[PDB]
């Protein structure tokens, strides 16, 4: 990550861009497993093996409350969603596949956001 991503405070204009990035991910066809916290009835052992869970609704709450001070902090929460998924689930599961697709999409949108900040 470059110096702007790590050290430049998030402005109100930056926050309008983060809201747009988040809504794009929430609208994606393969986002369904990540929209809300993992249901422990669907995965009884999940909260014993994943110590820092994360999901898109928790991120939306944090964006609305202006939790994030730097872009790096927002990227870290998003990356946690995909890393948790690839660690918990086997490489041939549909959950793992959704993580691969949605992370590629996040990177495309994130590059777009970074470009709009600087120029
Ligand atoms: C985002 C995420 O990781 N969610 C998630 C992953 C795996 C299951 C799961 O194990 N479902 N299941 C029940 N019986 N066989 C398979 C449920 C939810």
From Swiss-Prot:
Residues 9-113 form the Bromo domain. It comes from the Eukaryota. Ubiquitously expressed, with highest levels in testis. Present in kidney, liver and brain. In the brain, highest levels are found in motor cortex (at protein level). Disulfide bonds: none annotated. It is found in: Cytoplasm; Nucleus. Phosphorylation enhances DNA-binding. Interacts with MAZ. Interacts with KEAP1. Component of the NURF-1 ISWI chromatin remodeling complex (also called the nucleosome-remodeling factor (NURF) complex) at least composed of SMARCA1 (isoform 2), BPTF, RBBP4 and RBBP7. Within the complex interacts with isoform 2 of SMARCA1. Component of the BPFT-SMARCA1 complex at least composed of SMARCA1 (isoform 1), BPFT, RBBP4 and RBBP7; the complex is catalytically inactive and does not remodel chromatin. Within the complex interacts with isoform 1 of SMARCA1. The second PHD-type zinc finger mediates binding to histone H3K4Me3. Regulatory subunit of the ATP-dependent NURF-1 and NURF-5 ISWI chromatin remodeling complexes, which form ordered nucleosome arrays on chromatin and facilitate access to DNA during DNA-templated processes such as DNA replication, transcription, and repair. The NURF-1 ISWI chromatin remodeling complex has a lower ATP hydrolysis rate than the NURF-5 ISWI chromatin remodeling complex. Within the NURF-1 ISWI chromatin-remodeling complex, binds to the promoters of En1 and En2 to positively regulate their expression and promote brain development. It is linked to Neurodevelopmental disorder with dysmorphic facies and distal limb anomalies: An autosomal dominant neurodevelopmental disorder characterized by variable degrees of developmental delay, intellectual disability, speech delay, postnatal microcephaly, dysmorphic features, and mild abnormalities of the hands and feet. Belongs to the PBTF family. This is Nucleosome-remodeling factor subunit BPTF. The lineage of its organism: Eukaryota, Metazoa, Chordata, Craniata, Vertebrata. The gene is BPTF. The chain holds residues 2919 to 3037 of 3046 of the full protein.
């Amino acid at each position: 990550e470059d110096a702007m991503t790590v050290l430049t405070p998030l402005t109100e204009k930056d926050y309008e861009g983060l809201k747009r990035v988040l809504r794009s991910l929430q609208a994606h066809k393969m986002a369904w497993p990540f929209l809300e916290p993992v249901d422990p009835n669907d995965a009884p052992d999940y909260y014993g093996v994943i110590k820092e869970p994360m999901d898109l609704a928790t991120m939306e709450e944090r964006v609305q409350r202006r939790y994030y001070e730097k872009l790096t902090e927002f990227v870290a929460d998003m990356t946690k969603i995909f890393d948790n998924c690839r660690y918990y689930n086997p490489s041939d599961s549909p959950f793992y596949q959704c993580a691969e697709v949605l992370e590629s999409f996040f990177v495309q949108k994130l590059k777009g956001f970074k470009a709009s900040r600087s120029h």
